[PDB]
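Query form — protein High affinity immunoglobulin gamma Fc receptor I

QUESTION: What is the three-dimensional structure of this chain?
INPUT:
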Amino acid sequence: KAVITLQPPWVSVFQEETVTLHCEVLHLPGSSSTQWFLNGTATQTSTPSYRITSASVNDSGEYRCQRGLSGRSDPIQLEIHRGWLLLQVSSRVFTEGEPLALRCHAWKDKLVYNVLYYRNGKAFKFFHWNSNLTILKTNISHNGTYHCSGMGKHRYTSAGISVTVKELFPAPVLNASVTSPLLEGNLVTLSCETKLLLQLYFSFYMGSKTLRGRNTSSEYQILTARREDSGLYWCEAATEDGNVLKRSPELELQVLG
Ligand SMILES: *[C@@H]1O[C@H](CO[C@@H]2O[C@@H](C)[C@@H](O)[C@@H](O)[C@@H]2O)[C@@H](O[C@@H]2O[C@H](CO)[C@@H](O[C@H]3O[C@H](CO)[C@@H](O)[C@H](O)[C@@H]3O)[C@H](O)[C@H]2NC(C)=O)[C@H](O)[C@H]1NC(C)=O
Ligand SMILES: *[C@@H]1O[C@H](CO)[C@@H](O[C@@H]2O[C@H](CO)[C@@H](O[C@H]3O[C@H](CO)[C@@H](O)[C@H](O)[C@@H]3O)[C@H](O)[C@H]2NC(C)=O)[C@H](O)[C@H]1NC(C)=O
Ligand SMILES: *[C@@H]1O[C@H](CO)[C@@H](O[C@@H]2O[C@H](CO)[C@@H](O)[C@H](O)[C@H]2NC(C)=O)[C@H](O)[C@H]1NC(C)=O
Ligand SMILES: *[C@@H]1O[C@H](CO)[C@@H](O[C@H]2O[C@H](CO)[C@@H](O)[C@H](O)[C@@H]2O)[C@H](O)[C@H]1NC(C)=O
Ligand SMILES: *[C@@H]1O[C@H](CO)[C@@H](O)[C@H](O)[C@H]1NC(C)=O
Ligand SMILES: *[C@@H]1O[C@H](CO)[C@@H](O)[C@H](O)[C@H]1NC(C)=O
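ANSWER: The structure tokens for High affinity immunoglobulin gamma Fc receptor I are given below.
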């Protein structure tokens, strides 16, 4: 079960640039007997590192690898360009929570100022002096085609790249076993409704008060509903790690008695 890594991380590169593809398996091998594939066709390279000294149009395509131990790696698309500006991306398809590095790369490392970053045609970031954009933690709003524009001898634009940010679980919805306003003494079940679209830790809250902390149970019961229980209720759904947690819209419960 191999995996491809790039020395300069960028999946999109200019013509005449250096990019090295390394086939590495954590189940350790094996070593060197390597099997590199370009557009579903095996290449003459056996070295664990597929080095491209000066990139050209035919070096573009889908890459796959095999290292000693059986298990063909996930396919990675590498694209070589010509032009003035290039929006460089570290990955094309990834799950939310994973960081995303963006780079507005200029031809022959020329100096560019008044740099803009676009997501689906709309500019979202300005940099006076060219700088990299690293989104520490991604979500579904980061999905889409990215571009960059900057000022050199003239205002140049880069070609666009589609980035796919895959959603794990949708933002949760707090559902109550009874409708609001409810009568005092009622037994209420609070359920943090979400579906993993493929371990989840849930927590229940009331305004600022913590009702129940991190646990696998998607349910919480208000044993005997009192007037003091009237307020805004919301839940939080998160991965074991914690990396990713989503809050739910506030659900008001009015208790009458
Ligand atoms: C954006 O990031 C580029 C890549 O950096 C790596 O990835 C980032 C996401 C981040 O994790 C960072 O910490 C990593 O190192 C940066 O490019 C690096 O810096 C140079 C610019 O291309 C380059 O080098 C040069 O500098 C010497 C002088 O010291 C010159 O002689 C030479 O010609 C180069 O100009 C180096 O190859 C590169 N490093 C890697 C690992 O790719 C860069 O800071 C930044 N780019 C911009 C445009 O702001
Ligand atoms: C692996 O598949 C790649 C993608 O299909 C292929 O690259 C593509 O190749 C052609 C020709 O080299 C390019 O298409 C045409 O448009 C350009 C405009 O820049 C002109 O130079 C020519 O008219 C040209 O025929 C594609 O742009 C190019 N890249 C992509 C990303 O589609 C590779 O050649 C294949 N590599 C191997 C080793 O089989
Ligand atoms: C970002 O949003 C969606 C994912 O939430 C992207 O993909 C959609 O679904 C499939 C699978 O990737 C593709 O066939 C389509 O491109 C998208 N749906 C439709 C109905 O077209 C999507 O590519 C991203 N960006 C945009 C601008 O749609
Ligand atoms: C996707 O995550 C980003 C953060 O990575 C959220 O952006 C917040 O930060 C912006 C500017 O950086 C600030 O103006 C607002 O607070 C943004 O909301 C973004 O909201 C988020 N979207 C979803 C749907 O989760
Ligand atoms: C790239 O591939 C195309 C189509 O197979 C061919 O016409 C062309 O000569 C190749 N160019 C280089 C630089 O190898
Ligand atoms: C809670 O969700 C279940 C399943 O979708 C549904 O039967 C029920 O009506 C929901 N509760 C309310 C108060 O709508």
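ADDITIONAL NOTE: DSSP finds no helices and 27 strands in the chain.
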